[PDB]
Design a protein around this nucleic acid. Sequence first.
DNA 1: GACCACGGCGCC
DNA 2: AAATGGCGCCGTGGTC
Length: 539
Amino acid sequence: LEEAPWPPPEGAFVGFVLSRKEPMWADLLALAAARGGRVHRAPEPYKALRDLKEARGLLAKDLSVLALREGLGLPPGDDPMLLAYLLDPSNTTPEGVARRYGGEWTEEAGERAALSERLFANLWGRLEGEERLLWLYREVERPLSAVLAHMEATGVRLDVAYLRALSLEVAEEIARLEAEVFRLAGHPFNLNSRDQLERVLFDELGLPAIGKTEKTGKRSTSAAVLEALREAHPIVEKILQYRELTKLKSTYIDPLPDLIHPRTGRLHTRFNQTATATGRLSSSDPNLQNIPVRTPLGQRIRRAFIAEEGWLLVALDYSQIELRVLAHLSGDENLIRVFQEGRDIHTETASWMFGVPREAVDPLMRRAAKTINFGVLYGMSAHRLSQELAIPYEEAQAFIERYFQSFPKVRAWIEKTLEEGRRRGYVETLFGRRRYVPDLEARVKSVREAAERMAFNMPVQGTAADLMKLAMVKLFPRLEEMGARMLLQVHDELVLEAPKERAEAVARLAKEVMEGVYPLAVPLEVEVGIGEDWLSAKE
DNA sequence: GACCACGGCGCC
DNA sequence: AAATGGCGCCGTGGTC
Ligand SMILES: Nc1ncnc2c1ncn2[C@H]1C[C@H](O)[C@@H](COP(=O)(O)OP(=O)(O)OP(=O)(O)O)O1
Ligand SMILES: [Mg+2]
Ligand SMILES: [Mg+2]
């Protein structure tokens, strides 16, 4: 390519090099652009950023986030990663995509721009003819990247002092727990070392081993195993408490306060757009899609996530989303009738499990009930269900008998999906998002059956993802008009920030947009709450 | 210091 | 642990 002076012409493809992968924290080391047989290299990349109308290229969103960090409205445009990802969601990295579609991902901006230009050419050609993938790119993925860029740049406010205070409290309780364990062991050891724990539990103490680990064949010390051993010895219960507290301290309480951005004073995640096999987003650096919610300590952590002064959080969460999708994809009339007649399957299982009427079902019971229902749906063994519910095989068999008898045409949809996947090599969502599942014809039953479970899950999970993404696309411009913000997505939930004065309006509008995103044979239903913190906003 | 595999576990 | 699926992050034990 001819080296042309900087500034590029409109529509040029950008390439850029960051000191590190997180656009909110990175130094923009270099910036280049490519169009029509030329390459343009910025002498000063931060100043050169002002000349662009849009970020068009590989990882366009990341550059746009960094532009917003520096107060510039540079929205993301075409990204060959999004094209590769729609063709095959195993196309998740630029290293991989380049090798596949005609180049090499280097560390140099010029080359990254030229790569971006020619990869877009090649991948656009492959998507021609592929009209439904094309609709997804134009109407969902491409615009969603702009919405995510704004979410990432905005961040969420965290009560830092609270979390630091909470750390000292939890440290003390941890000391109490580890001291009891060592007493019960007759000696100290590193309780964070599962190998050392294995020896204590199974060699030194008498305790029976329940299972083995996958790769290396060690006697497992997992929560599942420890739960089964909970009466065998009093040490076990302390180990479970120790595990709870150290997980949350080490993953949430300690790291989060140190990730406050100095300019914003807020916490900034990355919403990864080409990371999953089903079309979901992921969140990383810090993952804010797995903030605790079950246990009392987890809930205390969730309270740290707060509204800006004089604003409120609005949390919107789809009700029984994948079940409703399943009713639509399958056409099971009994299951459609459940949702038209306004019944709640998670509470019905909860009342069954704990043996109490629906009026008396609490948060924990209902949560527990969700594992059971998605566990069973996506293929849990009788054996395993008998374990978690703590009942016999006969009983756990009989649960999974009725579950699927209730809803005849689910199994029929499962089989049609499996057959189509075997024939074409891929399965798809309601909108034609694909996942290639090659092992449906494997000769090893276990490999074949795992592949089957992945294959029938994807249309369901991915359709919910498609819906939520489309909902985000539609909702974002409406929020800007109202002076509200989209903060977080947690798969089937959204968290928004609204000025106090407008929070009720925002909530009503966001709920309608989410319920009417794309009507189905069953109604989509959204639960909404408003509060000063994340926990209160779904209380 | 970086990275790796693993077992383990937080959320949907 | 186990015939649920989809993620990312932590500490250990270990390499380079
Ligand atoms: N344990 C699980 N196994 C498989 N899929 C799950 C599991 N938990 C959650 N999911 C998937 C299926 C859910 O429909 C989807 C959204 O999560 P979630 O909001 O917690 O449940 P839900 O939408 O079905 O019930 P709720 O009415 O409480 O919102 O994520
Ligand atoms: Mg939900
Ligand atoms: Mg949810």
